[PDB]
Each structure stands twice: as structure tokens, then as C-alpha cells.
Write a protein that binds this ligand. Sequence first.
Ligand SMILES: CC(C)[C@@H]1CNC(=O)c2cc(N3CCOC[C@H]3C)nn21
Length: 528
Amino acid sequence: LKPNAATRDQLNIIVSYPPTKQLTYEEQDLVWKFRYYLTNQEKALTKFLKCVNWDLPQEAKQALELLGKWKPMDVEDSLELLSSHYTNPTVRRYAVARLRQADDEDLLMYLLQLVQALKYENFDDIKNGLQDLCTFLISRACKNSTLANYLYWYVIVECEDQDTQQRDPKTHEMYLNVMRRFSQALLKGDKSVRVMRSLLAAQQTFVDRLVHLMKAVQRESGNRKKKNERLQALLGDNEKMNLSDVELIPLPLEPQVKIRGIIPETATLFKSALMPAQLFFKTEDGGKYPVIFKHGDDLRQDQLILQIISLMDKLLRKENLDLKLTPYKVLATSTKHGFMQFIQSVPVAEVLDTEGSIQNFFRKYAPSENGPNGISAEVMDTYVKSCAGYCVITYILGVGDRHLDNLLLTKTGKLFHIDFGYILGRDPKPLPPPMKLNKEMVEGMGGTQSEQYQEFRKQCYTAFLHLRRYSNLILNLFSLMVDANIPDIALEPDKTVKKVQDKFRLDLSDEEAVHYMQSLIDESVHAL
Ligand SMILES: CC(C)[C@@H]1CNC(=O)c2cc(N3CCOC[C@H]3C)nn21
């Protein structure tokens, strides 16, 4: 009923394990032995549930009894209970009950993964509904238009996934039923929610017309100039395409922004194989919102990565660390098209081509006599911070294919990464470095001889230690994606979480982790 110091230190280590680390039989025996002692530690609950044999009715019954008496786990920790590991309905309900306590802002941060988690729910319960996870998500969406917006588009992407339809038709049918349940709940509610239903329908019609227009532009066989002219001609013709002027609708990419149409004369096609469009949306308040609209292209890996980057940024900010990151919005409107929030910027490759150096760039657009190397101290501070943030973040996420056209710069000093087609250690070339810096970025802050290089290192340490403390949440979110139709995940689903977990070096104390991170940055820089 009570363990000794040696046992306590063992149980404490077990309780410290990452969420998807498998417990040995001995550890399962130990956690079970002292389950009553552990009811006062909310962090031990997930470990106890992992040691239960849910196929033995008497054991499951006792486990559920202890679940009711356990000090409730932190809301975030409940995401683990919605993974593929748990089929016991009372466990999965308990998770939903904890998630009910999260505010709308936090729930939005997990919503992408929770939609994936529907794959592990009871498909008959979802169908027969025409709180479990489906009921909960719909309930929250009917009370928050932003949640409704993302729930709708997340689920409609799943419904149009032809891979799921062929490979797992029952899961495809479930997602159809979720959409039916969602539509059912919206129509049933009050005027505010019924209005939401009409606005979602209006969004879908707008995207449909945009998709049709993109296809019409590409039926053309002319050069890029002729295609831009066609794109602008079809956009300016509101009567046929109805995209120049439409009733106010929430922008699916960022529904807080209401749009009235697309500005026809400024729409152009990117000079790239897939020829995505740059479009400027007319916002409700007379402004402009530029986006990239990709067609014939799967944005879902980018969508996940930008969502995780947004979360990591919010976590850092919550720890009072604003590293000036650029988590631009990404929203798939289907498996073959979607939106990206366009940030005015210049690729580092272009900076080098035209200015020769990042320092030359900053001196042209942010000069200051007595600033570091003649550059505005504010701009340099922003550069150092964002370099540090993306260094740690892209390291944890194993982002590959890091050429200088995928590193973008702003005249305010912000550096950020784009194009996340290679993640989790994948790379076009072999033997990719665990940490991927490049000479030009270090040179941008004045080289290793600058004070800025040490402040860069210090910010990496601080961000690394902060994100380490949220490893349970970050790993839990990735555990809910292991069965997702994401290329670099589906390529090795059973090793996906471990590949992120390893980056945290949770075997190392904070002090050792700082030394490790220092060694990593210096060694990466030494290689140049
Ligand atoms: C040719 C483009 C599609 C190119 C390549 N792939 C991408 O995913 C991507 C993201 C991106 N950024 C532009 C600046 O604003 C932020 C973000 C939208 N540029 N690109």
C-alpha cells in the first residue's frame, strides 16, 4: 500500500516516461502493485491505464473504479487516451470529459489531431447518432464559429480522401457520418448556428468555383503570361465565375477574416511546376489578404507542420519567449487543393543572388550607424531570435530539403522556413545532418565571432528546454497522427513518434540537454 524510497524513485521514473514508451512487464506489475498509492499523482494515471488488461472484465472494472478515484490528469494529458491504444469506452469518455475543460483556443490547437482520432472511436455510435469524441467536437463547434470552420474543412478533407475510400471504406463512411452528424447539429440549433451552416455551405461553393477556375486556367496550353491573363480575365468576370464579388463569407484559411471576393488584376501564377496561384482577397474592412491557392497538390503534410509550429510558437510565448516566428496558416480544402497564408518575404537564395549576403540585405533595408555591423539592433534581435526558434523547431521535427529557396527573410529581420515536404528525418540527399544550419544564416548575424552568435545559442537552449517540458503534449499529438495519410508518417507509422521523441533527448537533464544542444549547434557550424 506504500512503497519505499527505491521503489518511489523507480515509480517516479516510470511516471516520467514519454507517452508512447512501452512499459515492461515488471513496470506494469509495479504500477499495478502501487496503484492505490499512485492515485494521488495525476501524472501516474496514464501509466496505470497503460498497464491494465482491458480484455479481462474484472480487471477493467477495477481499473475503471480507480479511474473515478484518481486525481484527474491534466487536460492536455487526456489526448493519450484517444489514441489507437484505448478501446474501452469509459476510458475514451473520460478523455473527452477532460477535454471538455479546455478552452476553445486550446481545443483548436488539438483539433486537427482529434479529427484523426475519430478513426479510433465506435463507428456504430457515430452512425446511430443520426459524450463521445464526435458528439463533443460537434457540440463545441456549434458554440464557436472558428471551431466549426476548422471542423468542417478537416472532416470534408477526410470525406474526399480517395485513399481512405479504397483502403478503409468503413473509416471513409464514418467521416461521411461525422459530416452528416455535424450538418444535423447545425440545422437543429438556433439562428446563430443555422447561420453557421449556411456560411459553411457558402464557403464550399466559393472554393468549388475557385477550383473550377484553376482547372480552366490550366486547360490553356499557353505560356505563363497568357495564363495569368486568363486567370485575371476569369476572376474579373463575376457573372460566370462569381469570385470577384460575393456576399461576405469567412475566409476558410482564417475565418476571423471575412472576404468579399478576389482582386482580379493582381492574381498571378507562381513560376513552378504546379503553377499555384497568388490571390489577394478583398477583406470585409477594405483590406487585402494574400494567399497561395494550390491545386492538384496535397497540402496535408504542410498543414500538420504549420499547425505544430503554431502550437510550438504558442507554447514558447506562454513561457514568455516570443522568438518572432512566422507560423503562417495552412488549410487543405481537399486532398488535392488548399490555401496558404502568404507572407511578404524574400528567399535567402534570392538575397544572396542580388545582395550577396544577408548582412548586405539588412544594411540596405534596415541601416543603423551604431547598430550591430551597421544594422538596426531591433532587426538583428529579431533575426537572432527567429533563427534560434526555427533552428530548434526544424531540428525537433526533422525537417529536410533545407535549401536556400526554403528559407525566407523579411525586412524586419524575421527568418522562417517553408515547404515541409520532407520531415521526420527524411531528406532528398543521404546522411542528412541531425541539425541543418547553413553558412549564410550564421553569417547573417555576423559570424561565429559576433556577440549575436552566442545570443543565438542562448535562445536555442531556452527554446529547447521549454519545448522539452511540453514533450508529452507534442508527442501525444503526433501519436494521434500515426495512421494519417501524411507521406512521411505513413511511410513508417510505428516509428513516427519515436523520431520526434529522440530529438528531445529526454534521457538528459536540463543541464546535459543544454550542453548537448550547444555541442549540436557548434558541430553543425564547424562543418559550416
Ligand atoms: C511556390 C510556393 C508554393 C512556395 C513553395 N512551397 C510552399 O509550400 C510555399 C510556401 C511559401 N510561403 C510564401 C510566403 O508566405 C508564406 C508561404 C505561403 N511559398 N512556397
